[PDB]
Design a protein around this ligand. Structure first.
Ligand SMILES: NC(=O)c1ccc[n+]([C@@H]2O[C@H](COP(=O)([O-])OP(=O)(O)OC[C@H]3O[C@@H](n4cnc5c(N)ncnc54)[C@H](OP(=O)(O)O)[C@@H]3O)[C@@H](O)[C@H]2O)c1
Ligand SMILES: NC(=O)c1ccc[n+]([C@@H]2O[C@H](COP(=O)([O-])OP(=O)(O)OC[C@H]3O[C@@H](n4cnc5c(N)ncnc54)[C@H](OP(=O)(O)O)[C@@H]3O)[C@@H](O)[C@H]2O)c1
Lengths: 485, 485
């Protein structure tokens, strides 16, 4: 396999994410032979540790992924550390020095990746100092990996983007969204464009509606502190759901290059309808989970640290509309919520029923293409066939495929994939500025109605798939949620 | 369920087919409540039996399908018999009498079905006498069920048709072909017309080639006496294969009525290309099985009662061409043979690979829709998806569906279905004159080249899928057999 020559700096190197997810992911790239001799990893945080102590931290982090002791040690030898406060400009001179020493020791010409595994408030600060204090390489590339979230409204995101653009171009920004790094999400484009029978049918003349579900069975848990201010709207819709929808609604690209894929996705995003107060009440539904059918399934307001006057949404369902010729009249239904009937991330594409008359009692129903992303990768195609009756009649049958154990074994973790894509300079599995800003504009419009309490807050029994208003939404267009639980 | 009022006469009533297949099939229709009070079954043959003895014959025939003794006896009470020689005109007066007595006893107004379970040489004779001797009902319908074969060449079939048309119209003729009475064969039209994504793709712009396989693992066995003069050509191709192809190549009908289905099938049959000597050598392959990989798999010439100078075909493979806009440039490959790798009756529809460039090492292959009819009903769709690799690449995955045990339990035997369809007057699962005559014209053209030895006779190892010439045939158009064994 070909060698990747790169120098990666991990801000928040002693963090939980760094030791649980980042280091093991990088180790994997080394095991596969992508990282060989010309690469270095510089960790940093305020904690005063020397190179040996940091190496031991990394050693303990990759412990459970070690087979060959020699292999582990050869990898660990590529790490170095430097204590540093991100708010102290002068202190950046010390980190600059460590970076240059590492590049010398391992002979790396530029090719720097900066990973921000720190609190969101530091994002803009760090980027500006990388530029002003001279940490950016003058050779090769310079890429920034920004952890979530990327803003909390269009305004803040716009501000962050502005600060980031001081030192980087948008094509150098890699916003983390682990859902886009999921293997099955990447199968959408393959199924669509790789098969003419689907490619030709991916439009208003064959599709009736598209449904995206991101259900969870757990509740707010110990995360009340954050969740109460975010809700399903900011925690699941704005980011994960919107980006999955981007893959589904995109135009057919000129080629499969990241640049062309983004242009095709943006054509869709730019045609998305932004709702006013009236439209929000008509096309969206917000809810909060009530009691379950036992006692441990307590209502959201009775959860720990939840203000008894919280009107936070633990569920969102809504209809999206694209003003593009291929999607004219095709609603895109989305829904995500806590304490629902099942944990599942799926896409259901409902095809219009055919008008051929068999003269049978039961006529042709709608065919459905389902792509289950979580918990296990699956693809199902519900088609119309002949029923086993004496008289000719139709029925639906399901053609299915499931990921094999061998498949599961070879599938890279989402973080490995994302770091690897960044080293490659491949932006196809990453949201760009345009897609993110539009996602924010769309969501802000809804938020405004919610914080101003200009829309009802619904309730639903824990364990159900949501309030009846969710079904009322689809019924208005003669549609129904495919996944019932 | 609604009651069927009918009087059925079984010529060859004491025959093997009558007691093994016919009577139990009719009994089933009674168990389901289709046959109630107004129906009678008149059996006939030369053997001198009285009504009691025939009833006992029927009793022993349905023995293994009895649960309720009372039910069995109520059914048996509807049977009567009359000794009769089909070559003796005068003797028909005696059968006429028995038929009219049965109609009185059970109050049946016309609605007569005559089943010919006798030797083929009697077919024309029986029909002519039914007319001249007055056995046809003057009220209701009169339908004739002709067992196989329907001729041995276009000439003989044309002669038989002429004799049959003395007393019946073609719409009253029901030619038996148990393959058309198979549940899965009837699922073709449902899959195609019931699903717009397939309906719209069932033409030259999406399909590369269609393949029909009717393989068997057994050899000529004890059937040398008949087989040696027929071959795979007359035994499997002319009848079974041609009619399955009819379902596949038909135009889209105006409605799903038997009349419209036949008109749509005939549009295809009429556009079928009849081959000359040159084309036969170029588009067809005849072979005979050689030795296997043990000793019990002896060559065809070493089979019992096989003339050491036999050039009989135990395998046929060929390309069919339809001169219709929807099939322009689309070859239909067919193959059937003995001592092949596996017993299987299937249809494989190869879709043209897409031209979208992923920039991957492995580009999009051809999608395949497979319909397995025998031994177990199955439907598979091979599609292009993303491979589980670090770099984006494509692979094919299989979406499958299999008939459930409950399905198998409810599926009517082919004979039950055929008799039931005849009582209903439904000709959709039956070949009409036009389809049969064209099938004969097509086959005769090939036969002529074979009996005149103007084409090579190939050889193949028992257990293989046929001679290499079979593969050479598809390779000429850049195609390959999907089912490898
Ligand atoms: N872990 C998860 O599962 C997860 C999942 C999704 C998203 N994320 C995101 O990843 C980022 C951090 O996650 P985490 O779980 O790893 O958090 P964490 O345990 O709190 O780690 C914070 C890191 O930042 C360092 N730090 C604090 N203040 C600093 C400063 N003033 N200057 C320099 N370094 C400073 C800390 O080291 P010192 O205290 O020694 O300075 C520590 O290494 C956040 O953006 C979070 O949203 C995490
Ligand atoms: N059984 C199978 O699996 C099978 C499968 C496919 C097709 N078929 C077709 O079904 C037909 C017969 O099959 P089979 O297996 O049932 O044969 P079979 O046992 O030979 O029966 C022949 C019947 O014809 C009667 N018969 C003979 N000569 C007659 C005459 N001169 N007048 C009146 N009746 C006469 C016989 O009764 P008498 O001798 O007492 O007159 C007997 O009942 C054939 O066309 C065959 O091709 C059979």
């Amino acid at each position: 396999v070909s060698e990747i020559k790169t120098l990666v700096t991990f801000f928040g190197g002693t963090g939980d994410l760094a030791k649980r997810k980042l280091y093991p992911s990088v180790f994997n790239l080394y095991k596969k032979g992508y990282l060989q001799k010309h690469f270095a990893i510089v960790g940093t945080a305020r904690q005063a540790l020397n190179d040996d102590e940091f190496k031991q931290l990394v050693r303990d982090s990759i412990k459970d992924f070690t087979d060959d002791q020699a292999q582990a040690e050869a990898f660990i030898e590529h790490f170095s550390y430097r204590a540093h406060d991100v708010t102290d400009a002068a202190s950046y001179a010390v980190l600059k020095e460590a970076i240059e020493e590492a590049a010398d020791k391992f002979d790396i010409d530029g090719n720097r990746i900066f990973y921000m595994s720190v609190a969101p408030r530091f994002f803009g600060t760090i980027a500006k100092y990388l530029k002003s204090e001279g940490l950016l390489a003058d050779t090769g590339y310079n890429r920034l990996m920004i952890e979530k979230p990327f803003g909390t409204s269009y305004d803040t995101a716009a501000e962050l983007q502005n600060d980031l653009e001081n030192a980087f171009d948008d094509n150098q920004l890699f916003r983390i969204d682990h859902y886009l790094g999921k293997e099955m999400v990447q199968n959408i484009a393959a199924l669509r464009f790789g098969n003419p029978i689907f490619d030709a049918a991916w439009n208003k003349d064959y599709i009736k509606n598209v449904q995206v579900t991101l259900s969870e069975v757990l509740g707010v848990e110990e995360r009340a502190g954050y969740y109460d201010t975010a809700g399903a709207l900011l925690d699941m819709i704005q980011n994960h759901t919107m980006q999955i929808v981007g893959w589904l609604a995109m135009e057919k690209p000129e080629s499969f290059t990241d640049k062309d894929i983004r242009a095709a996705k943006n054509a869709a995003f730019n045609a998305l309808k932004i709702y006013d107060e009236a439209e929000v009440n008509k096309y969206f539904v917000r809810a909060q989970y009530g009691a379950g059918d036992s006692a441990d399934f307590k209502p959201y307001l009775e959860e720990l640290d939840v203000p008894a006057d919280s009107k936070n949404n633990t569920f969102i369902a809504g209809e999206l509309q694209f003003d593009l010729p291929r999607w004219e009249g095709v609603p895109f239904y989305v829904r995500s919520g806590k304490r629902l009937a099942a944990k599942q991330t799926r896409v259901d594409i409902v095809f219009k029923a055919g008008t051929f008359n068999f003269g049978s009692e039961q006529e042709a129903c709608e065919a459905v293409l389902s792509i289950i992303i979580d918990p296990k990768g699956a693809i199902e195609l519900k088609l119309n066939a002949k029923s086993v009756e004496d008289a000719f009649n139709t029925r639906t049958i399901d053609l299915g495929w499931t990921v094999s154990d061998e498949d599961k074994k070879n599938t890279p973790e989402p973080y490995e994939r994302m770091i690897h894509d960044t080293m490659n300079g491949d932006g196809s599995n990453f949201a760009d500025w345009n897609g993110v800003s539009i996602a924010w504009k769309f969501v802000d419009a809804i938020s405004a109605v919610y914080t101003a309490d200009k829309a009802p807050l619904e309730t639903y029994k824990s364990g159900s798939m949501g309030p009846e208003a969710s079904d009322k939404l689809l019924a208005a267009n003669g549609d129904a949620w495919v996944f019932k639980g």
